[PDB]
Design brief:
The structure is cut from a larger assembly and holds 2 copies of chain A, 2 copies of chain B (48 residues), 1 copy of chain D (51 residues), 1 copy of chain E (40 residues) and 1 copy of chain F (546 residues). Helices cover 31% and strands 0% of the residues of chain A. Chain A is mainly alpha-helical and 49 residues long. The longest helix of chain A is centred in the middle third of the chain and has 15 residues. Chain D is mainly α and 51 residues long. Chain D has 1 helix and no strands. Chain D is elongated, with a radius of gyration of 19 Å. Classes of the chains: A mainly alpha (49), B mainly alpha (48), D mainly alpha (51), E mainly alpha (40), F alpha+beta (546). The complex binds adenosine-5'-diphosphate and magnesium ion. Chain C: It comes from Saccharomyces cerevisiae (strain ATCC 204508 / S288c).
Chain lengths: 49, 48, 48, 51, 40, 546, 77
C-alpha cells in the first residue's frame, strides 16, 4: 500500500542454494566419489603418490 | 526440356492478339513432339 | 535428332522404395553386358 | 496511458518501506511462506528423520 | 554438474591437474631442461 | 571432474586436449544428464513437461522425441542420443523415451566394467551375443495378432500407445477412433502388399466441447477458408463432382523474359482483352463439365470468382500439394497439373472429376473446415481433436500420431508381446543361465547387460511413488519359474507385468495392454549401436572456432 | 580389488580364485605380489593388527550413515 511495486516476500536470503528435487543426495555421493578417485590409486605398496 | 529458346537471352514481341494462340500452342508442341520421339523410342526412364 | 533405341540400355526392375523414411531409387540388373561392369553398394546406419 | 501515477502520496514514508495487508491473498502467501520451510521439517520428525 | 556449481576444493578454477603418461613427460623433459644447463 | 587438465603440454594444439578415464566419466554423466528429463516421462505414471523459448511461447510434451530436439546440447556425446530419439520416431514412431534410458544405463552399467581392465571390444562382444540370443528368445515368446475371433487386438494395442498422455483416460473412446481411421485409409501396392500411410489423416486443431465428444469424420476434412462470402456454403445431393487443379488460375504476365511491343495502337486493347479472356476460357469449360466443387493449389483472382458465384461453384484457394493428392486418391479424381492431351487441341474430359456424397463447410471457434464425406471409390478419415488451446493439442497431435504408427506395425506384423516390462524381465532369467555356459570374461558383460534391462520395470515403480523392490522381487519370482516351467497348458508364471494403478502383478493379456515385437527389435539394436558409439571413444579434440 | 589393479594383474582371475578357495584357505588366504600367485599369507610372515580393521569399518559405517540421513543442502551467502 505504501508502494506501487509490492515486492513478493522471499522466504530465504538472496543467493541461497537450491533445495529438494531429484539429485541432491546423488550430488553428495558423486562429490565423495570425486574425492575418492584422487585417493584411489594410492592403495597398497604398488600404488603411487 | 523447356520451351524453345537458345541459351542466351531473347526478345519475343506480340503485334496481334492471334499470335498468342500460336505461341501457347507451339510452346507445348515443342514439348509434345519430344514426347512422341520418346514414345517412338519406347524410353520409359529419363535422367536429366 | 540423334535420340534412338540403339543408344539406350535395359533393365528388368526399376523402382523407388520408401524403407522407413529413407527414400532410395534402385535399379536391378543390366542386360547390356559390357566389358567392365561397375559396382554399387548402399551404406545404411543408425547414425550419420 | 504510457505510465501510471505510481502510487501517489507515497512520500509520506520512505521508498524502502512496504505495506502488506490481508487482502490480495497475502495471508495465503504467508501460509505458503511457512509451507516452504515446513516441508523441510516433514523430513525431520521421527526416528526415520533426516538431518 | 546438474546445473549447480560443482566445487570441492577452494580456488577450483585456478589450480589444474595432470595424470597418465603426459604427467611423466612433463617430469622427464623438465629434468632434461635442467640437465642441458648442467651438461655443458 | 576434479580439475581441468593441462592445455597442450609439449603437444602444440590450438584447442583442448583430454584423455584417460576422465572423458569416459564425462560421457556417462553426459548421457545421464540428458536422460534425467526422460526418466520422469516414462510409463503411464510419468508426468509431462514444458519447454519455454524465452519469448513467452511454451509447448507441453511428454515424449522425448521433440524435447531433446528442442534442447540445444553442445556436448557431441549427447547429440547421438538426441539423434537416436529422432531416429526412433521416423522408423518405429514409438519408444523414443525408452531408447534414451536403455542406452544411458548400458553405458552407465558398463562404466564399472571399464575400470576392471575389461576392454570395450570384449564388452560389446558380450553384449552382442546377448543381443542375438535375446532376439531369438523374443522370436520364441511373441504371438500372432489375428490371435482371437474378437478384435480387441486392436482396441488393446491403442491403450499402450495412448498411455502416459493427457487423454489416456479417454483412450477407451479414442481406441475405436484410431482403428476405424486406419482401416479406412488403406491402399494396395506391390501386388497384394497392404500399406497404411501415416499422417494421411487430417489432425485439426479445434477448440470447443471436450476430447470425449470428438466426432470422427467418415471422410477427409480440408482445413481452408472459403474465398468469397456470397458463395453457397452447403452443397447437398449425391454424386458431387470434385475437381483437383494445380495450374495458375489468377491473371499472370507473359513468358519470363519477353517484352510486349506493338506499333498499331488499335490492337493494344485487344491483346489486353485476350489475356483477360484466355484465363476465363479455362473456367468456361469447367462449368461445362459441371464441377460443383473445385480446389486449386495457387490463388484465385476475382475475375474467376464471379463465374463460380454465378454458377454456384465452390472455389477454394490456398491448397497445399500433399493434401490434393489424398483428395484425388480418396474421391477418385486424378491430379491435373495442366489441361492438355496427346492431340494438339485443348479440352477437359469428365473422367478427371471425382465423386463424393456430401460437402459441408463447418466453423468451430474460428476454424473453418470443409467436411468432405462419402467418397465412393475409396474411403478416408479425419480426426477433429478438441481441447483447451493449441499447445495442449500439440501433445494430443503427437499422441495420435504415435498411435497410428503403433497400430500400423501390429497390422503389418501380427506378432505382439505384453507390456509392463515382461520381456525386459524375461531376458534376465534367460541370459543368466547363458552367461554361465560361455565361461570366460564375457560372463560379466552378458550379466551386466541383463541387469541394465531391468531399468524399464524399475522406472515404472519409482515414478509411481511406491515400493519398487517388492514389485520387482515378485516379478522376478514369477519369471524365475518360467525358465524352469517343466513342460509336460499349465505353463503359467509368464506374460505378467506391473499394474501401477492397483500395485499388483496380473495377466497383461486380460488387462488389455500389448506392443508389437518389431518395436522391441529395432529399439534394442539402435540402443546398442548408440552404446557402441560412445564406449569406443578414448580422447576428445575440441577445436575452437576461428 | 584396487590392490591388484595397481599391480597390473587382471581382477577377474584374482577375484574368482579368492571365492572358490576359502574352504582350504580358512582365514589366512590372501594375495601375494612376489610370486605373481595367490597363496597362504602365514608362510610369507606378513602380519597386520586388527585395530586398523575395526576403526576402519566403524568410521566408514559412521561416515556413510551420516550423509545417508541427509537429503538437504543449505548454503547462506
Ligand atoms: N497400462 C499400462 N500398464 C503397464 N505398463 C504400461 C502401460 N502402458 C504403457 N506401459 C509401459 O510403458 C512403456 C512405454 O510406454 P509408451 O507408450 O512408449 O510411452 P510414451 O508414449 O511416453 O513413449 C511400455 O514399454 C509399456 O510396457
Ligand atoms: Mg508410446
Amino acid at each position: 500500500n505504501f508502494g506501487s511495486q509490492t515486492p513478493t516476500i522471499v522466504v530465504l536470503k538472496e543467493g541461497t542454494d537450491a533445495s529438494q528435487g531429484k539429485g541432491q543426495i546423488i550430488s553428495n555421493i558423486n562429490a565423495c566419489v570425486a574425492v575418492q578417485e584422487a585417493l584411489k590409486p594410492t592403495l597398497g605398496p604398488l600404488g603411487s603418490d | 526440356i523447356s520451351p524453345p529458346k537458345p541459351d542466351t537471352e531473347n526478345n519475343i514481341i506480340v503485334n496481334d492478339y492471334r499470335q498468342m494462340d500460336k505461341i501457347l500452342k507451339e510452346e507445348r508442341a515443342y514439348l509434345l513432339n519430344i514426347c512422341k520421339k520418346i514414345k517412338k523410342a519406347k524410353c520409359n526412364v529419363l535422367l536429366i | 535428332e540423334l535420340f534412338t533405341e540403339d543408344r539406350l540400355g535395359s533393365a528388368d526392375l526399376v523402382e523407388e522404395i520408401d524403407s522407413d523414411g529413407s527414400k532410395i531409387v534402385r535399379v536391378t540388373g543390366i542386360r547390356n553386358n559390357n566389358a567392365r561392369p561397375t559396382v554399387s553398394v548402399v551404406i545404411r546406419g543408425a547414425n550419420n | 496511458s504510457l505510465r501510471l501515477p505510481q502510487n501517489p502520496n507515497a512520500g509520506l514514508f520512505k521508498q524502502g518501506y512496504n505495506s502488506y495487508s490481508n487482502a490480495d491473498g497475502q495471508i495465503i502467501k504467508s501460509i505458503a511462506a511457512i509451507r516452504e520451510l515446513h516441508q523441510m521439517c516433514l523430513t525431520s520428525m521421527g526416528p526415520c528423520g533426516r538431518n | 554438474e546438474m546445473g549447480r556449481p560443482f566445487i570441492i576444493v577452494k580456488d577450483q578454477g585456478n589450480k589444474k591437474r595432470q595424470h597418465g603418461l603426459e604427467a611423466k613427460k612433463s617430469h622427464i623433459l623438465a629434468a632434461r631442461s635442467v640437465a642441458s644447463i648442467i651438461k655443458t | 571432474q576434479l580439475f581441468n587438465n593441462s592445455r597442450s603440454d609439449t603437444l602444440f594444439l590450438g584447442g583442448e586436449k583430454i584423455s584417460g578415464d576422465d572423458i569416459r566419466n564425462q560421457n556417462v554423466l553426459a548421457t545421464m544428464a540428458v536422460a534425467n528429463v526422460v526418466k520422469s516421462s516414462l510409463g503411464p505414471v510419468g508426468l509431462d513437461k514444458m519447454l519455454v523459448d524465452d519469448i513467452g511461447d511454451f509447448t507441453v510434451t511428454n515424449d522425448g522425441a521433440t524435447i531433446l530436439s528442442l534442447l540445444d546440447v553442445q556436448h557431441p556425446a549427447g547429440k547421438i542420443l538426441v539423434e537416436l530419439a529422432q531416429q526412433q520416431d521416423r522408423e518405429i514412431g514409438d519408444g523414443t523415451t525408452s531408447v534414451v534410458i536403455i542406452a544411458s544405463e548400458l553405458l552407465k552399467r558398463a562404466n564399472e566394467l571399464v575400470k576392471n581392465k575389461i576392454h570395450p571390444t570384449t564388452i560389446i562382444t558380450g553384449f552382442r551375443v546377448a543381443l542375438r540370443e535375446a532376439i531369438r528368445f523374443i522370436n520364441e515368446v511373441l504371438s500372432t495378432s489375428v490371435d482371437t475371433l474378437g478384435k480387441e487386438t486392436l482396441i488393446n494395442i491403442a491403450k499402450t500407445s495412448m498411455s502416459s498422455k493427457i487423454i489416456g483416460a479417454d483412450s477407451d473412446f479414442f481406441s475405436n477412433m484410431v482403428v476405424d481411421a486406419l482401416l479406412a485409409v488403406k491402399t494396395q501396392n506391390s501386388k497384394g502388399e497392404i500399406k497404411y500411410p501415416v499422417k494421411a489423416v487430417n489432425v485439426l486443431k479445434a477448440h470447443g466441447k471436450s476430447a470425449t465428444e470428438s466426432l470422427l469424420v467418415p471422410g477427409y476434412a480440408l482445413n481452408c477458408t472459403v474465398a468469397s462470402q456470397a458463395m453457397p456454403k452447403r452443397i447437398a445431393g449425391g454424386n458431387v463432382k470434385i475437381a483437383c487443379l494445380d495450374l495458375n488460375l489468377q491473371k499472370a504476365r507473359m513468358a519470363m523474359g519477353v517484352q510486349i511491343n506493338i506499333d498499331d495502337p488499335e490492337q493494344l486493347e485487344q491483346i489486353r482483352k485476350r489475356e483477360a479472356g484466355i484465363v476465363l476460357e479455362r473456367v468456361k469449360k469447367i462449368i461445362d463439365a459441371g464441377a460443383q466443387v473445385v480446389l486449386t493449389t495457387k490463388g484465385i483472382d476475382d475475375l474467376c470468382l464471379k463465374e463460380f458465384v454465378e454458377a454456384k461453384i465452390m472455389g477454394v484457394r490456398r491448397c497445399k500439394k500433399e493434401d490434393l493428392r489424398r483428395i484425388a486418391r480418396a474421391t477418385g479424381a486424378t491430379l491435373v497439373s495442366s489441361m492438355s492431351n496427346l492431340e494438339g487441341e485443348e479440352t477437359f474430359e469428365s473422367s478427371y472429376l471425382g465423386l463424393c456424397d456430401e460437402v459441408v463447410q463447418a466453423k468451430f471457434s474460428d476454424d473453418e473446415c470443409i467436411l468432405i464425406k462419402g467418397t465412393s471409390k475409396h474411403s478416408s478419415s479425419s480426426i477433429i481433436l478438441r481441447g483447451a488451446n493449441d499447445y495442449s493439442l500439440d501433445e494430443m497431435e503427437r499422441s495420435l500420431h504415435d498411435s497410428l504408427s503403433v497400430v500400423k506395425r501390429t497390422l503389418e506384423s501380427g506378432n505382439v508381446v505384453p507390456g509392463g516390462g515382461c520381456v525386459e524381465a524375461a531376458l534376465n532369467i534367460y541370459l543368466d543361465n547363458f552367461a554361465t555356459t560361455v565361461g570366460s570374461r564375457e560372463q560379466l558383460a552378458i550379466a551386466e547387460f541383463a541387469a541394465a534391462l531391468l531399468i524399464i520395470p524399475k522406472t515404472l515403480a519409482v515414478n509411481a511413488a511406491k515400493d519398487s523392490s517388492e514389485l520387482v522381487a515378485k516379478l522376478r519370482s514369477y519369471h524365475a519359474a518360467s525358465q524352469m516351467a517343466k513342460p509336460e497348458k499349465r505353463r503359467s508364471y509368464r506374460n505378467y507385468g506391473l499394474d501401477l494403478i492397483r500395485g499388483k502383478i496380473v495377466d497383461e493379456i486380460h488387462a488389455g495392454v500389448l506392443e508389437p515385437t518389431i518395436s522391441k527389435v529395432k529399439s534394442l539394436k539402435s540402443a546398442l549401436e548408440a552404446c557402441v558409439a560412445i564406449l569406443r571413444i578414448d580422447t576428445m579434440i575440441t577445436v575452437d572456432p576461428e | 580389488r584396487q590392490l591388484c589393479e595397481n599391480a597390473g594383474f587382471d581382477a577377474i582371475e584374482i577375484l574368482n580364485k579368492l571365492r572358490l578357495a576359502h574352504s582350504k584357505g580358512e582365514k589366512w588366504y590372501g594375495v601375494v605380489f612376489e610370486t605373481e600367485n595367490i597363496g597362504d599369507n602365514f608362510a610369507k610372515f606378513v602380519w597386520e593388527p586388527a585395530l586398523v580393521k575395526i576403526n576402519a569399518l566403524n568410521s566408514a559405517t559412521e561416515a556413510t550413515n551420516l550423509i545417508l540421513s541427509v537429503d538437504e543442502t543449505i548454503t547462506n551467502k
